[PDB]
């Protein structure tokens, strides 16, 4: 896992639109 970040890897994050992460980097919001 990662620290700032805590997106899963199965896909089911569906972070954006709100998301907290400090370090996030899923493509999208990257
Ligand atoms: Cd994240
Ligand atoms: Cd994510
Ligand atoms: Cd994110």
Not at 4 to 26: I, L, R, V
């Amino acid at each position: 896992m990662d620290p700032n970040c805590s997106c899963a890897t199965d896909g089911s994050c569906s972070c954006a639109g709100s998301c907290k992460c400090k370090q996030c980097k899923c493509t999208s919001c990257k």
